[PDB]
PDB file of N, CA and C in Angstrom:
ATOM      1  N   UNK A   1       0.825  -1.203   0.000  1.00 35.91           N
ATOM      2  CA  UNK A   1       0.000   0.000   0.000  1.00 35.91           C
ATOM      3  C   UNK A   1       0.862   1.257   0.000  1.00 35.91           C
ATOM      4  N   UNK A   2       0.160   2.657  -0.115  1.00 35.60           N
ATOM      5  CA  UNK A   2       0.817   3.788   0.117  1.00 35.60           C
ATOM      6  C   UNK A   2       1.595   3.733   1.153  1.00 35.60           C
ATOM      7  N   UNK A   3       0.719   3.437   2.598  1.00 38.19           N
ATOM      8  CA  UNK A   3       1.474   3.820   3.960  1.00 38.19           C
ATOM      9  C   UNK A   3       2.764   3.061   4.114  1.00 38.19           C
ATOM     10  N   UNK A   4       2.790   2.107   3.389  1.00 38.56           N
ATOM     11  CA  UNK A   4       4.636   1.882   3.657  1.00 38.56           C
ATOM     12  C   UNK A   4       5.699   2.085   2.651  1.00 38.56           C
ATOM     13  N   UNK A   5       5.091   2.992   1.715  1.00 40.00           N
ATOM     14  CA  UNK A   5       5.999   4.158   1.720  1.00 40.00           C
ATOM     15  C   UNK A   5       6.122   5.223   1.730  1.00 40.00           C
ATOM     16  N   UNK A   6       4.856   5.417   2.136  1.00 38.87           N
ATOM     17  CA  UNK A   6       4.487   6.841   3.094  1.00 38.87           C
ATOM     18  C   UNK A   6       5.307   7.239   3.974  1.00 38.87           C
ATOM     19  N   UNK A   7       5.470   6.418   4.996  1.00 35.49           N
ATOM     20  CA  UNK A   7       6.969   6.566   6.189  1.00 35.49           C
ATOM     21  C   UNK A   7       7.712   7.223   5.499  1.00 35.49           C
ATOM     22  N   UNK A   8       8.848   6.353   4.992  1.00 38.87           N
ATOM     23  CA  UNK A   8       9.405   6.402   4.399  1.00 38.87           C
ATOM     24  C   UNK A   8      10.202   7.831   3.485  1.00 38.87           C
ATOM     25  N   UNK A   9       8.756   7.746   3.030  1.00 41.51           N
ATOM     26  CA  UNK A   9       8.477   9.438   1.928  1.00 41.51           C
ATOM     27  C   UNK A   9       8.380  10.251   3.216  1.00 41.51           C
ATOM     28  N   UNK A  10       7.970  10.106   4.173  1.00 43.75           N
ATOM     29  CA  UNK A  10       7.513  11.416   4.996  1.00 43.75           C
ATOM     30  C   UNK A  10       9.110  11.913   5.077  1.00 43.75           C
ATOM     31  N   UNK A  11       9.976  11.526   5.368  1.00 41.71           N
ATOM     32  CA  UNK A  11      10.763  12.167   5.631  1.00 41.71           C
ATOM     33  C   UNK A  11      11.670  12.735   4.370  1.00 41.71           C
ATOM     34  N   UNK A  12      11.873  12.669   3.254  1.00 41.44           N
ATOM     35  CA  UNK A  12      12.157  12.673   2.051  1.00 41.44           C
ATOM     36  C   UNK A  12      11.200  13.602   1.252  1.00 41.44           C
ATOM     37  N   UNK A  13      10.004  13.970   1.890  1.00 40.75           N
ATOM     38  CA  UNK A  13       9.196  14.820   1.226  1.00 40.75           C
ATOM     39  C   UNK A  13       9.787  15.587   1.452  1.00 40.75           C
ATOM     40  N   UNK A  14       9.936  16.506   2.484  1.00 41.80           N
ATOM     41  CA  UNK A  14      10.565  17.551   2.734  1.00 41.80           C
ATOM     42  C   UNK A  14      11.944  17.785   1.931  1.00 41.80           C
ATOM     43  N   UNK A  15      12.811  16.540   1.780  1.00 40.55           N
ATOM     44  CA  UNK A  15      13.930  16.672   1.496  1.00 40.55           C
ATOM     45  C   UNK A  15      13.727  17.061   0.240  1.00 40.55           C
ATOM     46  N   UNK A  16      13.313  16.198  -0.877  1.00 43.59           N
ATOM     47  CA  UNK A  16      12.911  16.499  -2.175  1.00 43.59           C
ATOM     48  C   UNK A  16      11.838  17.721  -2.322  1.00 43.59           C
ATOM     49  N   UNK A  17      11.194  18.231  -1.992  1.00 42.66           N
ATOM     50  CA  UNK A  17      10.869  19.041  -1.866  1.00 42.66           C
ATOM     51  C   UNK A  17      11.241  20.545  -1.944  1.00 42.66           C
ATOM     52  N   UNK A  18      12.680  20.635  -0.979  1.00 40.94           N
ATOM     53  CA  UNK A  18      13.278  21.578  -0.810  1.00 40.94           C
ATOM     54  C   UNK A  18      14.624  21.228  -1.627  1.00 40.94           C
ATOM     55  N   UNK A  19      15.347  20.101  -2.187  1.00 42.93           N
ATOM     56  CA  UNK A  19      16.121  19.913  -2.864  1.00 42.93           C
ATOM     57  C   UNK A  19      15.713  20.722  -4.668  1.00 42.93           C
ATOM     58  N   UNK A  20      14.793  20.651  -4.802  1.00 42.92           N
ATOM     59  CA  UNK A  20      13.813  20.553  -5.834  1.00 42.92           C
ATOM     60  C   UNK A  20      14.187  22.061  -6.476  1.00 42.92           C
ATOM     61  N   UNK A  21      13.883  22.700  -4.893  1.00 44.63           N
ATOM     62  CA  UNK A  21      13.638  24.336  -5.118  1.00 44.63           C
ATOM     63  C   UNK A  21      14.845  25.082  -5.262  1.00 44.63           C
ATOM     64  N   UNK A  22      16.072  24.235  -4.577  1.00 46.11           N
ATOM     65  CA  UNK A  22      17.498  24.660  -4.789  1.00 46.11           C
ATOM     66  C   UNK A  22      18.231  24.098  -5.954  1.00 46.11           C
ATOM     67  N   UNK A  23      17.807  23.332  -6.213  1.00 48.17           N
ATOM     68  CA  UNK A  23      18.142  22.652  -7.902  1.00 48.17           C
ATOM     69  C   UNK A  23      17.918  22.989  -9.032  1.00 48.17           C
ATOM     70  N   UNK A  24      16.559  24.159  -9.037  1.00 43.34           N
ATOM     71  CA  UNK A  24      15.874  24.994 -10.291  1.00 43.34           C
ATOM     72  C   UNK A  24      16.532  26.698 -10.045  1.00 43.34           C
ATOM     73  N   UNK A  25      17.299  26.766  -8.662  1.00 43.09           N
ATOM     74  CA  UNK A  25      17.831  28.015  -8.838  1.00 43.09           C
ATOM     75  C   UNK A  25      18.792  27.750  -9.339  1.00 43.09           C
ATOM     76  N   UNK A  26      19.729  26.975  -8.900  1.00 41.94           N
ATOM     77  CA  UNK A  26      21.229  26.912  -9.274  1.00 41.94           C
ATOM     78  C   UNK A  26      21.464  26.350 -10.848  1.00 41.94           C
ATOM     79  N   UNK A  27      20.567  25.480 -11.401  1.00 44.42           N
ATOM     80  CA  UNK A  27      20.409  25.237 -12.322  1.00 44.42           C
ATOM     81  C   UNK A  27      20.173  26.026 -13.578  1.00 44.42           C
ATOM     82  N   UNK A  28      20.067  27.505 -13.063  1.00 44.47           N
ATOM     83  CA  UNK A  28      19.817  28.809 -14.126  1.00 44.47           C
ATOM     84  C   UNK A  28      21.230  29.077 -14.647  1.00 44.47           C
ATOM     85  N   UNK A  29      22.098  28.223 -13.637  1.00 41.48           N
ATOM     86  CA  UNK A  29      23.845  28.653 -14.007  1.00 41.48           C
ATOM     87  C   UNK A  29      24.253  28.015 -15.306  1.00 41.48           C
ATOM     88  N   UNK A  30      23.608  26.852 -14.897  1.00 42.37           N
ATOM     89  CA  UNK A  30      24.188  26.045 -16.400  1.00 42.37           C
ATOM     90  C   UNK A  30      23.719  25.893 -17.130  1.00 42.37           C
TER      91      UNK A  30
END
């Protein structure tokens, strides 16, 4: 089901999430 990798994702949401948003700035470089 979702919920087991929901866990999982819960903590990684955030990560990807905010990886996401620093990856489309810096990415204007190259």
């Amino acid at each position: 089901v979702k919920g087991r990798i929901d866990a999982p994702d819960f903590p990684s949401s955030p990560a990807i999430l905010g990886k996401a948003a620093t990856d489309v700035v810096a990415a204007w470089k190259s």
